[PDB]
Design an enzyme around this catalytic site. Structure first.
Site, PDB file in Angstrom:
ATOM      1  CG  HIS A  91      -0.540   0.062   2.500  1.00  0.00           C
ATOM      2  ND1 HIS A  91       0.015   1.214   3.017  1.00  0.00           N
ATOM      3  CD2 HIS A  91      -0.572  -0.840   3.508  1.00  0.00           C
ATOM      4  CE1 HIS A  91       0.330   1.015   4.282  1.00  0.00           C
ATOM      5  NE2 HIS A  91      -0.013  -0.241   4.607  1.00  0.00           N
ATOM      6  N   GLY A 137       2.337   6.214  10.374  1.00  0.00           N
ATOM      7  CA  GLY A 137       3.747   6.011  10.002  1.00  0.00           C
ATOM      8  C   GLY A 137       4.299   4.685  10.482  1.00  0.00           C
ATOM      9  CB  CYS A 141       2.315   0.642   7.732  1.00  0.00           C
ATOM     10  SG  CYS A 141       0.775   1.554   8.058  1.00  0.00           S
TER      11      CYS A 141
END
Ligand SMILES: *[C@H](Cl)C(=O)N(c1ccc(-c2ccccc2)cc1)[C@@H](C(=O)N[C@@H](C)c1ccccc1)c1cccnc1
Ligand SMILES: *[C@H](Cl)C(=O)N(c1ccc(-c2ccccc2)cc1)[C@@H](C(=O)N[C@@H](C)c1ccccc1)c1cccnc1
Lengths: 305, 305
Positions: free
Chosen positions: B41, B143, B145
């Protein structure tokens, strides 16, 4: 985001952990520059526990009586001295992994990360707090002495604690890195009582702010109060008195949530008088006093290192 | 010794954390050998969130669209592919700090240490568990991920989780390191429900053993029971069924405490039917299901790494 007991990353402290032997006695040391720090009770034996004269025991001891292993590499001891309750082993090699560091005497209520160590090897890391009776509620077994407590600000490790002993009550006593004990405890096998342990009021209020910021807000009520009148209730439930400094320190959290400190005091006062009814806040059926306002801001603002 | 939520030391994983940019999108990557892993993503924009065709979006993308920073050193991307929900960025340099490692798909109820990361920089470490609805209750902000979950056995890091998204309920979803999601969750901005989360029965019993071994033994009673009859009560309080494997696994703890597993089941059954009366076990007013029998044996036998 949720909310957890979150330790600082332990990488910079792993590279400082060493094994220190003397006799049958093996505990953990901390290798900063050309000096290895550990508890002086390393020099004691099975007999000397009730009443050791450490000065006399250290007369019987020479550099070669001290086995420093950093991993498999043995380190040459070329120096030894006694600073209060810590031994300072001057070695031939400066730790190349030595991070930027400081020694700090932390205040009661402050928290830190413990890297629990056995045979100079890290086993685990967890967060905990200097209780107001100057004890800590850690997870330590036989061999853990020499394991250290620390905080990381910017790129700098602040060592604040070195573990020395478990008390009758199974809670933990230690020193700062200048070997002055936190509290009244001595490195002897003697009856010693940790005193009344009281709740860290200002830390609970940090946690209530944390709960709110996570959208967990049932306990918020329609009331306010005064310091004086909240303090009357705190003292009844063995909660530390809240100072104006404490209120100032909860500012960022007050501002970020739009909830006045003294309103939150009213929410806390009600929870103390009525309990929680089997309800939970941030997934706990008790009130949590081991997060400072800083810990909350780091975890809830996202500070890195 | 006391008993804490104890993470593995995070040193070996800190040296693997990198920053991956694409567009305005910056998240964390994991640099093992000459390959940097992160959530796919990363390639998405504000518009593409409701229904991204990742295959199409990755056609629009070339190596140079990917900014890998390990600290200040930029890494040259010379390769990119899509493995389920993870991006594999082949780079010019093999991570010199690469530890011995494995990728593992862990089972529901198993635990691991999360090194929470922002901009490729470690902020913190905590323990948590793969809930039986295949969600995790972590502490993650915007932030985070790319932050990874892991266990350490011998000298070998087993990566088991990579963080991808927070669900409506503020609980966390992610993948193993082959990018297969844990549970039914997709990397889309879509209504997704985590299912009934049930208590990890076998883990609670590990904790009761931990409490006993710490001398915290009030809840022990004079009764026994059968699996079948305990399971009848578990299912009522949304507790996972206990298998004979689960009983076998609690062996070391049974043997070490001299308390038969099915006696402990009787103690658990009573606690479920009667609550705790405002009492606490290992300093908690709730029953703790985020310690496995292994975690207890490590923490209560003293295993190092
Ligand atoms: C250190 Cl590796 C250790 O695990 N101890 C321990 C601490 C201190 C001493 C000691 C101190 C002065 C002179 C001689 C010896 C020995 C061992 C375990 C411990 O602290 N036991 C307590 C009961 C103790 C107190 C006072 C004197 C002796 C022993 C230990 C066990 C579990 C967790 N931490 C420490
Ligand atoms: C990643 Cl750094 C991040 O913090 N997110 C986040 C995750 C996923 C996506 C995404 C996925 C697919 C296509 C496009 C974008 C964007 C951001 C935050 C997050 O997960 N927000 C949730 C609400 C979300 C779910 C599904 C789609 C988009 C957003 C985040 C915030 C706090 C903790 N973890 C993650």
């Amino acid at each position: 985001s949720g909310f957890r007991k979150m330790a600082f990353p332990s990488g910079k402290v792993e590279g400082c952990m060493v094994q220190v032997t003397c006799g049958t006695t093996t505990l953990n040391g901390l290798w900063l520059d050309d000096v290895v720090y550990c508890p002086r009770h390393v020099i004691c034996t099975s007999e000397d526990m009730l009443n050791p004269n450490y000065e006399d025991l250290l007369i019987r001891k020479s550099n070669h009586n001290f086995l420093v292993q950093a991993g498999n590499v043995q380190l040459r001891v070329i120096g030894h001295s006694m600073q209060n309750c810590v031994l300072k082993l001057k070695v031939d090699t400066a730790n190349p992994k030595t991070p930027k560091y400081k020694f700090v005497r932390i205040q009661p209520g402050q928290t830190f990360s413990v890297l629990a160590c056995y045979n100079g090897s890290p086993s685990g890391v967890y967060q905990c707090a200097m209780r107001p009776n100057f004890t800590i509620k850690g997870s330590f077994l036989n061999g853990s002495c020499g394991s250290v407590g620390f905080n990381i600000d910017y790129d700098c490790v602040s060592f604040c604690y070195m573990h020395h002993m478990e008390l009758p009550t199974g809670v933990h006593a230690g020193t700062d890195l200048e070997g002055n004990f936190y509290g009244p405890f001595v490195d002897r096998q003697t009856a010693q009582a940790a005193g009344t342990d009281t709740t860290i009021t200002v830390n609970v209020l940090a946690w209530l702010y944390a709960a709110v910021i996570n959208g967990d807000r049932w306990f918020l009520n329609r009331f306010t109060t005064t310091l004086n009148d909240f303090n009357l209730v705190a003292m009844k439930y063995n909660y530390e008195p809240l100072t104006q400094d404490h209120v100032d320190i909860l500012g960022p959290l007050s501002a970020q949530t739009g909830i006045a400190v003294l309103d939150m005091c009213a929410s806390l006062k009600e929870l103390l008088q009525n309990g929680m009814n089997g309800r939970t806040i941030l997934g706990s059926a008790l009130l949590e006093d081991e997060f400072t306002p800083f810990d909350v801001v780091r975890q809830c603002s996202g500070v890195t290192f």
